């Protein structure tokens, strides 16, 4: 009993199939802020299920718990509203497969999309190292209020601009954003609008548009 | 709330900040005692962090109030 | 040979065409490639993942 | 048909095996969605009783990775056919030529982010006209063993299930062909005889007298796995020798 | 300072399916604005009459196959989904088709009805090869917008087929110079629509104008 | 049924300060956000009736690249400052004013002559600055009425004419929610004007122009 793999010393180290888990293929997420993770509907109604039960029975939409279960499984329109309320601020933890870095368990806020693909802000695709060619990330949630405060304070994706090893940022524009910036500022010897004095930046954008 | 940098210096440690905010949030979730700042659909925990940043909530204040009501 | 084959159709020799941006209705400067890349659909389907 | 091949797609498709290649030339007497009959050319006829090929194409059946193996006929009625040609396209074949994916008019340009690392936009048209759409065919197998305390029963009678579940089943306990099942619906109505010897020796007394339960059976029906739709094609039944075949 | 209002000067039917309309007069800048707005609004927000449900007599479920018809059932549904019909008045309507005998099963032999009209009878639906083989089917049709697949909108012979409610398939707008008219800078906006014949150019352009006018009138008054 | 489309309910009119507004509309159907946003942007930026300074001349200068003694700034600097002047004029199509003055200190818009109908919306707007008492500034400024942006090259020094009162317009579309369908595009237009008119009335004018344009069809 104190030896081997079933030895109860080395038991909480082998690996535990944690609840409130998830998975999905990944998809780029422009239009997200830098602290938002687009989470699917079909997976966010099976992660925050008990939270939905709580906020549903408490609101009285279905007091008895079994009614709440049968309501969520009925896809009734009210459950979408309640789920939006519960995930209003309830950080989720997105974890890539090999978690070498300590950034590999960063945590985001959720915003609900349709379909089924855990969207992910582009800039934070570096620390994870994902490449959007089939990479799959797991979604855990913190239950206890202390764990919620941890996921919002110690791990939120907006409090880890600087990676542990090297001081300089690891939220660094990567592939298309830099090409866009490069194009947006380059000296062309002669082109339309050459030789003039417009105003501050506002009239410059007006001129370009 | 999005970042928590403002709360770091208020409770210098960044972990005692976590536990103090959790104390206040637990007080404000089922222990009644509504937040002293208005909410914007925010969860109780974010309101706790917000008030911590406002400076009107700290571990000393929570202990003082707990002792005061424990004398009752 | 590709240049000649394209030239048999009326399409430009470059292989690039000007593309308009659908959402606004302006022109993309820097003309862009457009062709027929025979794409697959590998069976890593999301709803099995 | 790929728009840019290499001249090897033809041979790969012909010799792969799933293309229903002819055997003797002649004329296509009678095409069909499930059979092609080829009148043999006179010269190639045997010494007796020629004029028959009856190429039994393969209508929809499951593959080893859930992809329909569907063979369609690619010959117009009456068209002559030469030996070793392609009478019926297989899965991913087009007049013989191998066709794995599909064309798609692409434009290499970085749009607003959505192709950031390697992502790929796709206009609704590609899904609207439905040119990428597979026909995965699953195979759920339900079995009826005989454990301790009597055999397993496949009867439609199941306790603790609403009339909705039994609405689409048949009397035997097996769903009808072409039943648009969904998540949670019972495919096969299976049950087990309520656990084992429990409680106390009074329970052994009951077993001696036999219990007093009309149900006397636990629910173990095999349902659709959660998250998959589907239209049942076929439901095969297999029987151990010495078991009388039931209604289904 | 005045803004010359536009008008639909001409609607020439170059072909049965696709056609071109001309807008005139337009002033500088307004050309591309209206052209893009009309292309964008036309390509999505239109009414159609695409088939929605099919019920073939001797077909149990979609993935089966009938007899005497080389086309599999799925190909039949594909072609029906490609079928184009012009339906007025009645919201939804049922059509019948019971062609028998060898040969094509083109839409022409679909059972006649009232205001329903098959725009393109030549479009093949399926084929018959066996003399004593008949394909009898009821085809439902409703009217809608955009795209509504089978699953979202969801007997056993009720074969659901994905909607494709849309009359237009390619909208292109060009802006060019008009006559002198004692005033230069007047833009002629030529809009060509490639439609499946169910909708005429004038009706489509006017409906697009109406929908955009309503959406923008929702902007006229603000708090 | 087909004619039905989700009409917006005007919600956000957030007017930051007095000229920078951030309007939002929702819920619109799939893609209407972009088409409305682009239409409004193009019509506002390109065609908006208004009046702006077009030509300016200095009494003692005829060359663009020169200077006036006692002036801390240079001619082009004054040209830019005048370009930033916001002025609304009565129904008179165009009119000429003068900036005759002499002294020491900044020279603002308020120093401009009223000239009856013409009223500068921002008198405190800064134009020039003199340092010597003997230095006297005298110059003529002509303002016309127009419906767009007129670069100088497209044309007695020339000032690019920004007739359109709207100074900036940026629209975004962000996915809103209605029950289940969650691809509806909440539009968000932030626009800022020179000050001759608030953003609300600017949006009203743009919408009315577009609606009148479409009127002939229906
Ligand atoms: Mg990878």
UniProtKB/Swiss-Prot annotation, chain B:
The EC designation for this entry is 2.7.7.6
Q: Does the keyword Nucleotidyltransferase apply?
A: yes
The Swiss-Prot or TrEMBL record annotates one GO molecular function as: DNA-directed RNA polymerase activity
Q: Which enzyme class?
A: transferase
- Output the Gene Ontology cellular-component terms: DNA-directed RNA polymerase complex
* Catalysed reactions, semicolon-separated: RNA(n) + a ribonucleoside 5'-triphosphate = RNA(n+1) + diphosphate
For the keyword Endoplasmic reticulum, the answer is: no
**Keywords associated with the record:** DNA-directed RNA polymerase, Nucleotidyltransferase, Transcription, Transferase
Q: Name one GO biological process term.
A: DNA-templated transcription
Disulfide-bonded cysteine pairs: these are none
| Quaternary structure, from the entry | The RNAP catalytic core consists of 2 alpha, 1 beta, 1 beta' and 1 omega subunit. When a sigma factor is associated with the core the holoenzyme is formed, which can initiate transcription.
What the protein does comes down to: Promotes RNA polymerase assembly. Latches the N- and C-terminal regions of the beta' subunit thereby facilitating its interaction with the beta and alpha subunits.
Q: Which family does it belong to?
A: Belongs to the RNA polymerase subunit omega family.
Q: What is this protein called?
A: DNA-directed RNA polymerase subunit omega
Please tell me the species this chain comes from.
Answer: Escherichia coli O139:H28 (strain E24377A / ETEC)
Query: Complete protein: which residues are present?
Result: 3 to 74 of 91
């Amino acid at each position: 009993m104190i030896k081997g793999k079933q030895g109860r010393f080395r038991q909480n180290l082998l690996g535990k199939r944690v609840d409130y888990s998830g998975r999905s293929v990944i998809t780029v997420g422009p239009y997200l802020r830098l602290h938002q993770c687009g989470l699917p509907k079909k997976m966010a109604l099976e992660l925050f299920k008990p939270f939905i039960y709580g906020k549903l029975e408490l609101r009285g939409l279905a007091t008895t718990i079994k009614a709440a279960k049968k309501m969520v499984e009925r896809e009734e329109a009210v459950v979408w509203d309640i789920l939006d309320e519960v995930i209003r601020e309830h950080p989720v933890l997105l974890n890539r497969a090999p978690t070498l870095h300590r950034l590999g368990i960063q945590a985001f806020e959720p915003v609900l999309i349709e379909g089924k693909a855990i969207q992910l802000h582009p800039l934070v695709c570096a620390a994870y190292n994902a490449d959007f060619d089939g990479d799959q990330m797991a979604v855990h949630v913190p239950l206890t209020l202390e764990a919620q405060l941890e996921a919002r304070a110690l791990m939120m994706s907006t409090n880890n601009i600087l990676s542990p090893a090297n001081g300089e940022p690891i939220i660094v524009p990567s592939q298309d954003v830099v090409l866009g910036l490069y194009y947006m500022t380059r000296d062309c010897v002669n082109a339309k609008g050459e030789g003039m004095v417009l105003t501050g930046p506002k009239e410059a954008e007006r001129l370009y548009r | 709330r999005v970042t928590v940098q403002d709360a770091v210096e208020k409770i210098g440690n960044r972990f005692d900040l976590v536990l103090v905010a959790a104390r206040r949030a637990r007080q404000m979730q089922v222990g009644g005692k509504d937040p002293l700042v208005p909410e914007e659909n925010d969860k109780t925990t974010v309101i706790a962090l917000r008030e911590i940043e406002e400076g009107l909530i700290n571990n000393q204040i929570l202990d003082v109030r707990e002792r005061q009501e424990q004398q009752e | 040979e590709i240049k000649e084959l394209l030239k048999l159709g009326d399409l430009p020799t470059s292989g690039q065409i000007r593309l308009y941006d659908g959402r606004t209705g302006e022109q993309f400067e820097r003309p862009v490639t457009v062709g027929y890349m025979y794409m697959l659909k590998l069976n890593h389907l999301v709803d099995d993942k | 048909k790929p728009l840019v091949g290499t001249g090897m797609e033809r041979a790969v498709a012909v010799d792969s095996g799933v293309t229903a290649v002819a055997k003797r030339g002649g004329v296509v007497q009678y095409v069909d969605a499930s059979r092609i009959v080829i009148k043999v050319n006179e010269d190639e006829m045997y010494p007796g009783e020629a004029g028959i090929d009856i190429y039994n194409l393969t209508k929809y059946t499951r593959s080893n990775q859930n992809t329909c193996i569907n063979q369609m006929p690619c010959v117009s009625l009456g068209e002559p056919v030469e030996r070793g040609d392609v009478l019926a396209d297989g899965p991913s074949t087009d007049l013989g030529e191998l066709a794995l994916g599909q064309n798609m008019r692409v434009a290499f340009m970085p749009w607003n982010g959505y192709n950031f690392e390697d992502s790929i936009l796709v206009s609704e048209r590609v899904v609207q006209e439905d040119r990428f759409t597979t026909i995965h065919i699953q195979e759920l197998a339900c079995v009826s063993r005989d454990t301790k305390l009597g055999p397993e029963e496949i009867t439609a009678d199941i306790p603790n299930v609403g009339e909705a579940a039994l609405s689409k089943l048949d009397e035997s306990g097996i769903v009808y062909i072409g039943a648009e099942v969904t998540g949670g619906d019972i495919l096969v109505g299976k049950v087990t005889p309520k656990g084992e010897t429990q409680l106390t020796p009074e329970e052994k007394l009951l077993r001696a007298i036999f219990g007093e339960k009309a149900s006397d059976v636990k629910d173990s029906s095999l349902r659709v796995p959660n998250g998959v739709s589907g239209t049942v094609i076929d439901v095969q039944v297999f029987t151990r020798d010495g078991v009388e075949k039931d209604k289904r | 300072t005045e803004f010359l209002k536009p008008r639909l000067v001409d609607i020439e039917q170059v072909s049965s399916t696709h056609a071109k309309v001309t807008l005139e007069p337009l002033e500088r800048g307004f050309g591309h604005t209206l052209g893009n707005a009309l292309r964008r609004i036309l390509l999505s927000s239109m009414p159609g009459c695409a088939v929605t449900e099919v019920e073939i007599d001797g077909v149990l479920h979609e993935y089966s196959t009938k007899e005497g018809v080389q086309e599999d059932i799925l190909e039949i549904l594909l072609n029906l989904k490609g079928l184009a019909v012009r339906v007025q008045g009645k919201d939804e309507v049922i059509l019948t088709l019971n062609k028998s005998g060898i040969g094509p099963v083109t839409a022409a032999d679909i059972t006649h009805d009232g205001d329903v009209e098959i725009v393109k009878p030549q479009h093949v639906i399926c084929h018959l090869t066996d003399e004593n083989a008949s394909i009898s089917m009821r085809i439902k049709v409703q009217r809608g917008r955009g795209y509504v697949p089978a699953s979202t909108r969801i007997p056993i012979g009720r074969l659901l087929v994905d909607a494709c409610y849309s009359p237009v398939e390619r909208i292109a707008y060009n802006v060019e110079a008009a006559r002198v008219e004692q005033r230069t800078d007047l833009d002629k906006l030529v809009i060509e629509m490639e439609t499946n014949g169910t909708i005429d150019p004038e009706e489509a352009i006017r409906r697009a104008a109406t929908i955009l006018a309503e959406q923008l009138e929702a902007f006229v008054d603000l708090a």
